Design a protein around this motif. Structure first.
Motif, PDB file in Angstrom:
ATOM      1  N   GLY A  32      48.117  44.446  48.045  1.00 54.62           N
ATOM      2  CA  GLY A  32      47.568  44.424  49.400  1.00 54.62           C
ATOM      3  C   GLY A  32      46.320  45.285  49.513  1.00 54.62           C
ATOM      4  N   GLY A  33      45.830  45.463  50.734  1.00 58.28           N
ATOM      5  CA  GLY A  33      44.679  46.327  50.972  1.00 58.28           C
ATOM      6  C   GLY A  33      43.321  45.667  50.787  1.00 58.28           C
ATOM      7  N   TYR A  34      43.303  44.357  50.539  1.00 58.98           N
ATOM      8  CA  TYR A  34      42.048  43.619  50.566  1.00 58.98           C
ATOM      9  C   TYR A  34      41.613  43.422  52.008  1.00 58.98           C
ATOM     10  N   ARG A  35      40.307  43.515  52.220  1.00 60.91           N
ATOM     11  CA  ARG A  35      39.709  43.282  53.525  1.00 60.91           C
ATOM     12  C   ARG A  35      38.744  42.122  53.388  1.00 60.91           C
ATOM     13  N   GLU A  36      38.858  41.134  54.273  1.00 64.88           N
ATOM     14  CA  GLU A  36      37.916  40.006  54.267  1.00 64.88           C
ATOM     15  C   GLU A  36      36.515  40.450  54.707  1.00 64.88           C
ATOM     16  N   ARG A  37      35.515  39.951  53.982  1.00 56.06           N
ATOM     17  CA  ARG A  37      34.106  40.160  54.314  1.00 56.06           C
ATOM     18  C   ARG A  37      33.480  38.798  54.539  1.00 56.06           C
ATOM     19  N   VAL A  49      35.441  35.842  50.722  1.00 52.73           N
ATOM     20  CA  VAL A  49      35.113  37.131  50.106  1.00 52.73           C
ATOM     21  C   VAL A  49      36.111  38.181  50.613  1.00 52.73           C
ATOM     22  N   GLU A  50      36.724  38.920  49.687  1.00 56.57           N
ATOM     23  CA  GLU A  50      37.625  40.017  50.054  1.00 56.57           C
ATOM     24  C   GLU A  50      37.318  41.191  49.159  1.00 56.57           C
ATOM     25  N   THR A  51      37.381  42.401  49.703  1.00 57.57           N
ATOM     26  CA  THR A  51      37.148  43.583  48.868  1.00 57.57           C
ATOM     27  C   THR A  51      38.200  44.673  49.057  1.00 57.57           C
ATOM     28  N   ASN A 103      36.939  46.291  43.957  1.00 57.91           N
ATOM     29  CA  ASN A 103      37.219  44.902  43.577  1.00 57.91           C
ATOM     30  C   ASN A 103      36.592  43.935  44.564  1.00 57.91           C
ATOM     31  N   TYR A 104      35.857  42.956  44.037  1.00 55.99           N
ATOM     32  CA  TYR A 104      35.369  41.845  44.843  1.00 55.99           C
ATOM     33  C   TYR A 104      36.176  40.632  44.439  1.00 55.99           C
ATOM     34  N   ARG A 105      37.039  40.158  45.339  1.00 58.23           N
ATOM     35  CA  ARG A 105      37.818  38.939  45.070  1.00 58.23           C
ATOM     36  C   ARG A 105      37.125  37.780  45.773  1.00 58.23           C
ATOM     37  N   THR A 126      38.590  24.834  42.838  1.00 56.56           N
ATOM     38  CA  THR A 126      38.618  26.167  43.418  1.00 56.56           C
ATOM     39  C   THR A 126      38.897  27.161  42.313  1.00 56.56           C
ATOM     40  N   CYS A 127      38.043  28.180  42.206  1.00 50.53           N
ATOM     41  CA  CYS A 127      38.265  29.263  41.252  1.00 50.53           C
ATOM     42  C   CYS A 127      38.311  30.581  42.001  1.00 50.53           C
ATOM     43  N   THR A 128      39.166  31.486  41.546  1.00 45.51           N
ATOM     44  CA  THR A 128      39.257  32.810  42.152  1.00 45.51           C
ATOM     45  C   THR A 128      38.921  33.814  41.079  1.00 45.51           C
ATOM     46  N   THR A 129      37.982  34.698  41.393  1.00 48.36           N
ATOM     47  CA  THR A 129      37.594  35.732  40.455  1.00 48.36           C
ATOM     48  C   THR A 129      37.687  37.108  41.102  1.00 48.36           C
ATOM     49  N   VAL A 130      38.116  38.091  40.318  1.00 48.27           N
ATOM     50  CA  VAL A 130      38.049  39.495  40.732  1.00 48.27           C
ATOM     51  C   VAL A 130      37.039  40.174  39.830  1.00 48.27           C
ATOM     52  N   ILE A 131      35.968  40.643  40.454  1.00 50.21           N
ATOM     53  CA  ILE A 131      34.940  41.436  39.782  1.00 50.21           C
ATOM     54  C   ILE A 131      35.195  42.889  40.133  1.00 50.21           C
ATOM     55  N   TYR A 132      35.401  43.706  39.109  1.00 46.00           N
ATOM     56  CA  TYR A 132      35.606  45.140  39.295  1.00 46.00           C
ATOM     57  C   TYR A 132      34.310  45.870  39.019  1.00 46.00           C
ATOM     58  N   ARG A 133      33.844  46.633  40.008  1.00 45.58           N
ATOM     59  CA  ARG A 133      32.687  47.510  39.809  1.00 45.58           C
ATOM     60  C   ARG A 133      33.105  48.957  39.980  1.00 45.58           C
ATOM     61  N   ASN A 134      32.891  49.761  38.946  1.00 46.78           N
ATOM     62  CA  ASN A 134      33.294  51.155  39.040  1.00 46.78           C
ATOM     63  C   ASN A 134      32.365  51.945  39.956  1.00 46.78           C
ATOM     64  N   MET A 135      32.769  53.178  40.265  1.00 45.39           N
ATOM     65  CA  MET A 135      32.018  54.026  41.184  1.00 45.39           C
ATOM     66  C   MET A 135      30.562  54.168  40.736  1.00 45.39           C
ATOM     67  N   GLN A 136      30.343  54.201  39.423  1.00 44.03           N
ATOM     68  CA  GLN A 136      28.996  54.352  38.873  1.00 44.03           C
ATOM     69  C   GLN A 136      28.224  53.047  38.643  1.00 44.03           C
TER      70      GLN A 136
END
Length: 115
Positions: A7-12, A50-52, A59-61, A92-102
């Protein structure tokens, strides 16, 4: 390379930042280049959702409609030159892109539903 939380994704909104579309093209072109039997890049028809999720990194889902592009894998992928034909099979494809703090990004997952 991962942010793990239930949980904890927020729609953008896909209207609110051009980076969602940029990242969608990055993920789709990178993934499709790694796929067996593939001759052409897949491309992004639409960013449908878009969810983050954020702790330190984010995470950008992205929920995407994807189709085979008109660009061969032996060519350089270009987002505004490699569009799919309307008659190409869409999925339909679903991707999670992880971007670290840096600021370093990777594709944590890329999963496509059948056409």
């Amino acid at each position: 390379m991962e942010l793990a939380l239930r949980g904890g994704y927020r729609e953008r909104s896909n209207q609110d930042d051009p980076e969602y579309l940029e990242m969608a093209h990055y993920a789709t072109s990178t993934w499709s280049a790694q796929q067996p039997g593939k001759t052409h890049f897949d491309t992004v028809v639409e960013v449908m959702k878009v969810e983050t999720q954020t702790v330190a990194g984010t995470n950008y889902r992205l929920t995407l409609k994807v189709a085979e592009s008109t660009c061969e894998l032996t060519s350089t992928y270009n987002k505004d030159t490699c569009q799919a034909n309307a008659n190409a099979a869409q999925r339909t494809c679903t991707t999670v892109i992880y971007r670290n703090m840096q600021g370093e990004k990777s594709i944590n997952s890329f999963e496509c539903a059948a056409a």
